[PDB]
Amino acid sequence: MFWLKTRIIEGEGSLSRLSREVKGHERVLILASGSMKRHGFLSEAEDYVKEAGAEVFSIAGLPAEPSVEVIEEFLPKVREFGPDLLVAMGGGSVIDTTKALKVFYDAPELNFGEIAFIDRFSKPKPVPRLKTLLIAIPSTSGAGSEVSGASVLKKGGVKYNIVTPEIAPDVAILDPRLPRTMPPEVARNSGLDVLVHGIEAYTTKVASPFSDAMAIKAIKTVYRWLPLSVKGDEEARARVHYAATMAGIAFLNARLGLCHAMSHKAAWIGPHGLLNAVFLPYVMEFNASKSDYARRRYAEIARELGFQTAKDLIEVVKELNEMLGVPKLGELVDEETFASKVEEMAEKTYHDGLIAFNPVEPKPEEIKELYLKAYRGE
């Protein structure tokens, strides 16, 4: 299918639209990153909420890696306030944290381990109706959590997923002023996450014309604008910001692929968006070598960028990575350590449900060989 729950508000100054969006709600809770507080954006959001006649309470300074345990720490405060509207302001992790909070707040009867999943050998129960409106306000460009029905967080040190349309945000507000405060490396990494989301969404087994429309526009936009953006160009930051959400609309519908999976299993090495960028060329090469469908799809993307072939697309991504100063795997982690982890990462990758949507189903050995090839870095 193709669907989109979230209503998207976008444009310069569009944070102020929060006043209109909270109309009819009296008690607004905002979870925000430390950076949203420091830059004064949290106080602006609070001001916009109070303009509309609501009371507001904010919890700022959330851990970068969300966890059930930390959410359980402030859940009592949330229940004491009793919001009828939730706002997430910050990166993907802040949105993920707020999505999980929504589940716990709206359905306190649920057992976490019964509704979340670790991998394809989990069997989660479906989440029931979750009534509290959720507004997502991304400050990075970006993970696309502001339109997805997915959240990732730890419990007991282990990484879990929750996926349901019940936590896809009702509203996303895309005000490019917020991502203009990303430091350069965050702009680079989150930008490359957009590119990899787009390219993977375009080549899954369940891509539609409708998801493709969004994936192709996101890819073109990042390709043209990300380097200017990383160096602080104000318009480029806006263009890439909207592109991040486009890629989110794409992968919400088309899912993601082997690159996202391998990147997540290698997260100990460094930032997702960066590891995605490093692995993508190798994933594209692998997929094209084993699937004429994938090769043809990569060539279609190449033609949208002004080239011809799958090979061109792989070379374009590699050169963009260099332009943006993305390191080789070798420069992030030493051979001994990598080789010691490669087996478990390849198995955990193989155990990821996303593999089913990749245009090729890889064997654990192939994935292991793939990790090793990316490490050798040629």
Ligand X SMILES: Nc1ncnc2c1ncn2[C@@H]1O[C@H](COP(=O)(O)OP(=O)(O)O)[C@@H](O)[C@H]1OP(=O)(O)O
Report the interface residues with ligand X, using CB under 6 A: 33-35, 64, 90-94, 139-140, 142-143, 178-179, 181-183, 186, 190
Contact partner at residue 191 from ligand X, a copy of itself, none, CB < 5 to 8 Å by partner kind: none
Question: How many whole angstroms from its chain centre is CA 266?
Answer: 16
249 binds a copy of itself (CB under 8 A): yes
3 binds a copy of itself (CB under 8 A): yes
Contact partner at residue 245 from a copy of itself, ligand X, none, CB < 5 to 8 Å by partner kind: a copy of itself
Question: From the CB of residue 163, how many other CB atoms can be counted at a distance below 10 Å?
Answer: 18
Longest dimension (CA), the chain: 60
Question: From the CB of residue 60, how many other CB atoms can be counted at a distance below 10 Å?
Answer: 17
Q: How far apart (Å, rounded) are the C-alpha atoms in residues 32 and 60?
A: 5
Which residue in the set 214, 256, 262, 301 belongs to the binding site for a copy of itself (CB under 8 A)? Answer: 214
Which span sits near a copy of itself by CB under 8 A: 25-33, 42-50, 55-63, 243-251? 243-251
Which span sits near a copy of itself by CB under 8 A: 90-98, 202-210, 277-285, 317-325? 202-210
- Whole-number minimum distance, CB 293 to ligand X, in Å? 30
Contact partner at residue 249 from a copy of itself, ligand X, none, CB < 5 to 8 Å by partner kind: a copy of itself
Which C-beta is closer to a copy of itself: that of 217 or that of 348?
217
Q: Give the up-direction half-sphere exposure of residue 22: CA atoms within 13 A in the CB hemisphere.
A: 28
Q: How far apart (Å, rounded) are the C-alpha atoms in residues 30 and 33?
A: 10
Query: Whose structure tokens read 């997929």?
Result: 287
Amino acid letter, 212: D
Which C-beta is closer to a copy of itself: that of 239 or that of 255?
239
223 binds a copy of itself (CB under 8 A): no
Q: How far apart (Å, rounded) are the C-alpha atoms in residues 326 and 322?
A: 6
- Whole-number minimum distance, CB 302 to a copy of itself, in Å? 15
240 binds a copy of itself (CB under 8 A): no
DSSP result, 286-355: HHHHH-HHHHHHHHHHHHHTT--SHHHHHHHHHHHHHHTTPPPGGGTS-HHHHHHHHHHHHHHHHT-GGG
| Contacts to a copy of itself by CB under 8 A | 1-4, 6-10, 208-210, 212-214, 216-217, 221, 239, 242-243, 245-246, 249
